[PDB]
A = this chain, B = another copy of it.
Amino acid sequence: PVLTTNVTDFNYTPSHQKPFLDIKQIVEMTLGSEGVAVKLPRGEDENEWLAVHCVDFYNQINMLYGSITEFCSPQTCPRMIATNEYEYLWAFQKGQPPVSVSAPKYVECLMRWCQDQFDDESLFPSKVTGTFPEGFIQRVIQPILRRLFRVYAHIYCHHFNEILELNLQTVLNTSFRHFCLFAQEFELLRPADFGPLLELVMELRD
């Protein structure tokens, strides 16, 4: 949930997942940085296609957070924010009210939660002989995409300078563009799910 208005032990720890098979200033920096597979194939299963890409998107965000993880600590980022207009909250026990947490605690919990869904055989069948549950796209895929977006939002609004230092602007913008086009093709994310990055999506998408 969304609230709209030298210690290293507690930074985000990356983990790769095995394959399934103000805002105006921020956006101008993003576009200026550049100067320095979406459709379901015919005969292919939609759930499988969406499952494949959901694990792939997790892995791109894992690689991108991992590149800057030493710059995001509970002292640099005491709240999970995407500018001062958006704060994102985490519920530690399911069905309980979400709370304010530092950005790396948030990212850690969220990413480990995604891996727990990928690793759950009743959600993501790990054999050819398994099936997907009813409501898979709405009940599993959509919540995962909505949450992974919040990680992109924190990176762009609070760590873009570091991404630029490492020359990862094009990899970041390419991943995000593919994430947003994929969500559009299947109506997984709507304009409101983009929060502070709406203009970015308007520019990058096309």
Using a CB–CB cutoff of 8 Å, the interface residues on chain A facing chain B are 14-16, 59-60, 63, 66-67, 70-71, 165-168, 170-171, 174-175
Contact = CB atoms under 8 A, between A and B. Distances in A.
16 contacts: A14-B66, A15-B70, A16-B70, A16-B71, A59-B165, A60-B166, A60-B167, A63-B67, A63-B168, A66-B66, A67-B67, A167-B174, A167-B175, A168-B171, A170-B170, A170-B171
A71 B175 CA distance: 21
Main secondary structure of the interface of A (DSSP, over half): helix
* Most chain B beta carbons < 10 A, residue from A14, A15, A60, A167: A167
A166 B63 contact: yes
Contacts of A171: 167-168, 170-171
Nearest to A69: B14
Q: 6 shortest A-B CB distances, which residue pairs?
A: A16-B70, A63-B166, A63-B67, A171-B171, A66-B66, A167-B171
Contacts of A16: 70-71
